[PDB]
From Swiss-Prot, chain A:
DNA-dependent RNA polymerase catalyzes the transcription of DNA into RNA using the four ribonucleoside triphosphates as substrates. It comes from the Bacteria. Belongs to the RNA polymerase beta' chain family. The RNAP catalytic core consists of 2 alpha, 1 beta, 1 beta' and 1 omega subunit. When a sigma factor is associated with the core the holoenzyme is formed, which can initiate transcription. This is DNA-directed RNA polymerase subunit beta'.
From Swiss-Prot, chain B:
It comes from the Bacteria. The RNAP catalytic core consists of 2 alpha, 1 beta, 1 beta' and 1 omega subunit. When a sigma factor is associated with the core the holoenzyme is formed, which can initiate transcription. It comes from Escherichia coli O139:H28 (strain E24377A / ETEC). This is DNA-directed RNA polymerase subunit beta. The gene is rpoB. DNA-dependent RNA polymerase catalyzes the transcription of DNA into RNA using the four ribonucleoside triphosphates as substrates. Belongs to the RNA polymerase beta chain family.
């Protein structure tokens, strides 16, 4: 399967606020942290990301 | 637009948001056959409504 994140064009009226992301965690389900900081790494995939 | 036949007061009007309390009063008007809409987004989104 290849997941394709749809832009605003084929989105409904409700799907406008949801900002898409691949969130990076651990084997226990804990949020892995960005280098030297306490950020939970959230790589927000922009428009048309295969 | 479902009125209450017994007195004829306008309880609820067409194309309104659905709430618990008026459902009770409605079925008590003796009307036990109503007509929901199918607006599920995706294939048939809430357009005309």
């Amino acid at each position: 399967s290849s997941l394709v994140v749809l832009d605003s064009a084929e989105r409904t009226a409700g799907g406008k606020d949801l900002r898409p992301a691949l969130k990076i965690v651990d084997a226990q389900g804990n949020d892995v942290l960005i280098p030297g900081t306490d950020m939970p790494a959230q790589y927000f995939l922009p428009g048309k990301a295969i | 637009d479902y009125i209450d036949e017994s007195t004829g007061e306008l309880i609820c009007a067409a194309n309104m948001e659905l709430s618990l309390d008026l459902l009770a009063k409605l079925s008590q008007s003796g009307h036990k056959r109503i007509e929901t809409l199918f607006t599920n987004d995706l294939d048939h989104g809430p357009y005309i409504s």
